[PDB]
Scaffold this active site. Sequence first.
Site, PDB file in Angstrom:
ATOM      1  N   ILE A   1       0.832  -1.197   0.000  1.00  0.00           N
ATOM      2  CA  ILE A   1       0.000   0.000   0.000  1.00  0.00           C
ATOM      3  C   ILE A   1       0.868   1.248   0.000  1.00  0.00           C
ATOM      4  CG2 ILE A   1      -1.489   1.452   1.403  1.00  0.00           C
ATOM      5  CD1 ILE A   1      -3.057  -0.973   2.196  1.00  0.00           C
ATOM      6  N   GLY A   2       1.773   1.324   0.968  1.00  0.00           N
ATOM      7  CA  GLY A   2       2.685   2.445   1.072  1.00  0.00           C
ATOM      8  C   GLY A   2       3.472   2.391   2.364  1.00  0.00           C
ATOM      9  N   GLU A   3       4.324   3.386   2.574  1.00  0.00           N
ATOM     10  CA  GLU A   3       5.066   3.501   3.818  1.00  0.00           C
ATOM     11  C   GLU A   3       4.310   4.419   4.767  1.00  0.00           C
ATOM     12  OE1 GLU A   3       8.233   1.972   4.656  1.00  0.00           O
ATOM     13  OE2 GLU A   3       7.450   0.750   3.004  1.00  0.00           O
TER      14      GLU A   3
ATOM     15  N   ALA B   1       4.188   6.057   9.122  1.00  0.00           N
ATOM     16  CA  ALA B   1       5.033   6.534  10.211  1.00  0.00           C
ATOM     17  C   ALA B   1       5.743   5.390  10.943  1.00  0.00           C
ATOM     18  CB  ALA B   1       4.210   7.365  11.192  1.00  0.00           C
ATOM     19  N   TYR B   2       5.252   4.168  10.762  1.00  0.00           N
ATOM     20  CA  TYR B   2       5.791   3.011  11.476  1.00  0.00           C
ATOM     21  C   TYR B   2       6.663   2.120  10.592  1.00  0.00           C
ATOM     22  N   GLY B   3       6.418   2.163   9.288  1.00  0.00           N
ATOM     23  CA  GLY B   3       7.106   1.281   8.360  1.00  0.00           C
ATOM     24  C   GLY B   3       6.189   0.821   7.245  1.00  0.00           C
ATOM     25  N   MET B   4       6.317  -0.441   6.853  1.00  0.00           N
ATOM     26  CA  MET B   4       5.565  -0.947   5.712  1.00  0.00           C
ATOM     27  C   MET B   4       4.099  -1.234   6.022  1.00  0.00           C
ATOM     28  SD  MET B   4       6.352  -4.158   3.222  1.00  0.00           S
ATOM     29  CE  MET B   4       7.607  -3.197   2.382  1.00  0.00           C
ATOM     30  N   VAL B   5       3.223  -0.796   5.124  1.00  0.00           N
ATOM     31  CA  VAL B   5       1.809  -1.108   5.225  1.00  0.00           C
ATOM     32  C   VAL B   5       1.355  -1.855   3.983  1.00  0.00           C
ATOM     33  CG1 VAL B   5      -0.508  -0.218   5.540  1.00  0.00           C
ATOM     34  CG2 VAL B   5       1.428   0.934   6.621  1.00  0.00           C
TER      35      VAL B   5
ATOM     36  N   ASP C   1      -2.278  14.758  17.425  1.00  0.00           N
ATOM     37  CA  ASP C   1      -1.744  14.806  16.061  1.00  0.00           C
ATOM     38  C   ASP C   1      -2.851  14.651  15.027  1.00  0.00           C
ATOM     39  OD1 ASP C   1       0.328  15.217  14.210  1.00  0.00           O
ATOM     40  OD2 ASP C   1       0.864  13.095  14.141  1.00  0.00           O
TER      41      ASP C   1
END
Length: 340
Positions: free
Chosen positions: A22-24, A26-30, A140
Amino acid sequence: GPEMVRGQVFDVGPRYTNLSYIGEGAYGMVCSAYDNLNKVRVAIKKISPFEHQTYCQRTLREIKILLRFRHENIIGINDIIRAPTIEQMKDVYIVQDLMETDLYKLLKTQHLSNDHICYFLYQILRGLKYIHSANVLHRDLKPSNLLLNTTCDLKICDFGLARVADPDHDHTGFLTEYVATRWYRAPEIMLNSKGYTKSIDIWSVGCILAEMLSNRPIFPGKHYLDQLNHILGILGSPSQEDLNCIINLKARNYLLSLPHKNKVPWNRLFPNADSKALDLLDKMLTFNPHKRIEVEQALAHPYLEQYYDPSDEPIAEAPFDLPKEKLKELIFEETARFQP
Ligand SMILES: N#Cc1c[nH]c2ncccc12
């Protein structure tokens, strides 16, 4: 072996299969994946926090908060995947409802009808009522943290920066460093606030409403102090009464040093906006945080009259330093319920 994606280990099987990058985040790979148990595609985010105490903290924060919250307008945690032992646990995978898009993506490409603005705003506030009822600050809120499904149902995500409210300890000095996304920071963050009060979140919602009205962020500051002069460029100079509420001399004298700035009327900034929406916007983007509208007042504003129903806007049942080793263990315990 484990599933691979973009040359990286994404070890979620065998329950979750047919992975799609899907994409990157704030935590890493999604990725998205097919849930062979619920026969539906889901979202999975991979987290790797164990080398750093701060990462361990943001991860533990999110997991604990999301597991305790249960609300239609807040993203839940469906499942958590990790190794059976602490020794073997390198990553943690968080499984959540797959959502078509988010408000950041939508605003890049789509004009919103007034009806859509009104529905999105209602849902953001409904979720925020529950969060604040738990004595929690999100801290946030921004379009990329608002997920939307194919029928425009909205869910608040990312509690990595959340905190329990602590108004008695909110005061600080001028130009105190802050972590949350710049464009959505209330003016007091730059002046005398640690962002430990609920009013911080309301400011962010006001910024989001303005952004929905025009598809452009209202205060796109380029650096810490520039953010404030964007804000003042629209609200105009603070009143004497609002200055007198700021006791800190460095903060007050900075404001006094500025040339006078006139307020820009909301209806000139947003000439096709609904007048009731602009009245509510004004109350959310109030300079003095003590005068800023609170979430339950915002829900009761005439703009939202078609949706407002306090009996259907639920609250939480109860209110809500450590080294990484103790944190890894706490994450291990916090995620135990999803084993095997
Ligand atoms: N993080 C996260 C997500 C949780 N649900 C999602 N749906 C589409 C894209 C990302 C997500």
